[PDB]
Amino acid sequence: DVTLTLWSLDRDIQPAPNLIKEFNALNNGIKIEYRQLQFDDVVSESMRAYSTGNAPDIIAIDNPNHAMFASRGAFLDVTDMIAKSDVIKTENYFPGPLKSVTWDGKYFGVPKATNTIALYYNKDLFKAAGLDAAKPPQTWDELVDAARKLTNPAKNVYGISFSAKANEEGTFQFLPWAQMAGATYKNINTDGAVKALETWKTLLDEKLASPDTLTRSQWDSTATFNAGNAAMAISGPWEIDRMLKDAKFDWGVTLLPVPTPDAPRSSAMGDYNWAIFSKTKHPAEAFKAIEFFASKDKDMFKNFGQLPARSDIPVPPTGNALKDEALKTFVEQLKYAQPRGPSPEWPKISKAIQDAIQGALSGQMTPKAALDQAAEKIKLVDG
């Protein structure tokens, strides 16, 4: 057999290792050995590996990181193999995800999936508080008021759960709020972005969200929602299958509330891309593996609750009512997602945003000072 290696953050029950097990069973002359990364290690360490000669054949890389590797020659140019493919077609892909694998008019990967975040809510806790579970919050004011009503320390419940962690989690969580109020990562210190960061301060200052929001991932925050310890959760479709298993209450999911009535919806484009490292000894076999993964995209939602990065295969209902309502919401919010980048310096941009979030939420800097400092850094690095 040709033996390939593949690195991803996907947990044992998420797509990558399960796709690998199905692929290996084909006995097609190719085998894949999986290594699970940690979220926080996929990047500067996979760059270390590439630079030393320790890189795998294949990686699933977060979409905003793709340009760093592609621009540096770390990823294989798959343009010709895509053109020849009878399985992968570039016109199948949503334009944002496709753009994220491109550099200088060449393809340097194939999108794996796509997502964005939305607002989960526990309808039983809404009802118990005298709230209308059929009318979840539409604006930031309504969201904050609901979160106040739902915050009940005597019952071990926070009104809301989210993530402000000092890594890509916090940036991905924050950008939607800043964008809805008219800012972007290229202009992150507008009065609207300040208002977004003030609103986060309110959530923490009034103890409507756990203080662990500052250090806790989206996944670990949503676990608290699933357990009934937070009445609402801002997170992605990657939560659905676990929530179905673990949440023992009635729940819904809706679009992210907007800053003023009928202000624009907005969020950030999530999820990963497949890429082949440039010095692979097995480019054809690695690409065959990615063709196989792409061939399974049609089953991704039903089997894993994640969303393909493709317009050719709109996701059908599963038949589970909760899951199908979540699908409708995520499909609708995704229509408002904006890309982080393209930028080969995304991590530096993101770090500037992370530091502003931490500076303001900790009370060390005002929101305005914090975001002014981020914007100055971004102006330099995004040049």
Ligand X SMILES: OC[C@H]1O[C@H](O[C@H]2[C@H](O)[C@@H](O)[C@H](O)O[C@@H]2CO)[C@H](O)[C@@H](O)[C@@H]1O
Which spans of this chain sit near ligand X (rule: CB under 6 A)? 14, 39, 62-63, 115, 168-169, 172, 217-219, 236, 238, 270-271
Q: What does 27-45 look like in DSSP terms, one character per residue?
A: -SSEEEEEEE--GGGSHHH
Nearer to ligand X, 272 or 287 (CB): 272
Nearer to ligand X, 151 or 358 (CB): 358
Q: 3-state DSSP call for residue 175? A: helix
Q: Closer to ligand X by CB, 117 or 360: give it.
A: 117
Three-state secondary structure readout of 263-319: CCCCEECECEEEEEECCCCCHHHHHHHHHHHHHCHHHHHHHHCCECCECCCCCCCCC
- In whole angstroms, how close is the CB of 67 to ligand X at the nearest point? 14
Least spacing, CB of residue 285 vs ligand X, in Å: 26
To the nearest whole angstrom, how small is the minimum distance from the Cβ of residue 175 to ligand X?
10
Please provide the DSSP assignment of 57-119 as one string.
SEEEEEGGGHHHHHHTT-B---HHHHHH-SS--GGGB-HHHHHHTEETTEE--EE--BB--EE
Whether residue 137 has a cis bond before it, omega within 30° of 0: no
Q: Tell me the β-bridge partners of 298.
A: none
Q: How far is the CB of 69 from ligand X (least distance, A)?
A: 15
Q: By C-beta, is 216 or 288 nearer to ligand X?
A: 216
Instruction: Report the amino acid identity of residue 25.
Output: A
- Alpha-carbon span 275 to 383, nearest angstrom: 26
Q: Which is nearer to ligand X, 159 or 236 (CB)?
A: 236
Nearer to ligand X, 280 or 358 (CB): 358
Minimal distance, residue 217 CB to ligand X, in Å: 5
Burial (CB count <10 Å: 0-12, 13-18, 19+), residue 252: middle
Question: Using CA atoms, how far apart are residues 8 and 60, in angstroms rounded to an integer?
Answer: 5
Output 36 or 260, the one with its CB closest to ligand X.
36
**Which residues, in sequence order, are bridge partners of residue 218?**
none
Q: Exposure of 37 by Cβ count < 10 A (0-12 exposed, 13-18 middle, 19+ buried)? A: middle
Q: Kindly report the number of other CB atoms within 10 A of residue 267's CB atom.
A: 26
Work out how close the CB of 101 gets to ligand X at its nearest, in angstroms, rounded to a whole number: 14
Distance of closest approach, residue 136 Cβ to ligand X, in angstroms: 22
Q: How far is the CB of 132 from ligand X (least distance, A)?
A: 30
Distance CA 383, CA 381 (A): 5
Cβ distance to ligand X smaller for residue 114 or 151? 114
Smallest gap from residue 172 Cβ to ligand X (A): 4
Which of 211, 130, 217, 209 is closest to 171 using CA atoms? 217
User: Which residue, 41 or 191, is less far from ligand X as judged by CB?
Assistant: 41
What's the closest the beta carbon of residue 230 comes to ligand X, in angstroms? 15
Closer to ligand X by Cβ: residue 139 or 338? 338
Question: Residue for token digits 């991905």?
Answer: 172
Q: Give the Cα separation of 24 and 31 in Å (integer).
A: 5
Could you tell me the CA-to-CA distances from 286 to 100, 152, 320 in Å, in that order?
20, 52, 35
